Design a protein around this ligand. Structure first.
Ligand SMILES: [Zn+2]
Ligand SMILES: [Zn+2]
Ligand SMILES: [Zn+2]
Ligand SMILES: [Zn+2]
Length: 220
């Protein structure tokens, strides 16, 4: 039916008929510390292992932090750098963003894509909200532009945010909750075009050396 890219989490792929539709713009929404970056690292890790060109744009953390985080889950991004992976640091060389504007970000991503060569690509923009902190009302116009142009350049895109959702082809929501001294984390596919997606909230775990693990389905 459609060409789907694995999330890197098999149990999650089951929830969306094999994975994310190629060319989609996917909004990952939720409070800080809810697993959105890790979820994204899975997507890139899987792409890299698949031979996909991969680009990760980071606006809150350093490139090194992203790399260290990935190592936590037995992903080794270092030797892919400038070969099949470019991490663009919007928090701070040629793969840096001076100004956090939408066009500067796209131009830099396209520059990176030219370095990495032909082929379907994965892009993470973590986070897309950094683009409109000061222009909250531009969120929709910015996301439409980002989606149109990045899809044109053969990307399937994850965009984290802590109008984006409405422009997005899919929406995955992340939650955390403390109850009786316990932390519980949850994920929900709120929207996914062209996909008979699961509508249940799922409990997830973040496990060292593994990453996000689906623990079970919530009812009602
Ligand atoms: Zn570095
Ligand atoms: Zn729990
Ligand atoms: Zn739906
Ligand atoms: Zn049910």
């Amino acid at each position: 039916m459609v060409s789907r890219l694995s999330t890197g989490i098999l149990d999650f792929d089951k929830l969306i008929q094999g994975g994310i539709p190629q060319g989609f713009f996917i909004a990952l929404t939720g409070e800080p510390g809810t697993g959105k970056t890790i979820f994204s690292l899975h997507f890139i890790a899987k792409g890299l292992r698949d031979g996909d060109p991969c680009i990760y744009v980071t606006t809150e953390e350093s490139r090194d932090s992203i790399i260290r985080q990935a190592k936590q889950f037995n992903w080794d991004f270092e030797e892919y750098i400038e070969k099949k992976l470019i991490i663009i640091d919007a928090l701070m060389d040629q793969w840096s963003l001076v100004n956090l504007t939408p066009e500067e970000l796209v131009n830099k991503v396209i520059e990176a894509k030219q370095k990495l060569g032909y082929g379907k690509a994965r892009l993470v923009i973590d986070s897309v909200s950094a683009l409109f902190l000061d222009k909250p009302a531009m969120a929709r116009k910015i996301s439409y532009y980002l989606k149109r142009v990045l899809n044109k350049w053969n990307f399937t895109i994850y965009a984290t945010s802590q109008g984006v959702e409405h422009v997005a082809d899919g929406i995955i929501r992340f939650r955390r909750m403390i109850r009786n001294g316990e932390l519980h984390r949850y994920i929900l596919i709120e929207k996914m075009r062209q996909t008979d997606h699961d509508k249940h909230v799922w409990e997830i775990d973040i496990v060292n050396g593994k990453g996000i693990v689906l623990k079970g389905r919530l009812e009602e």
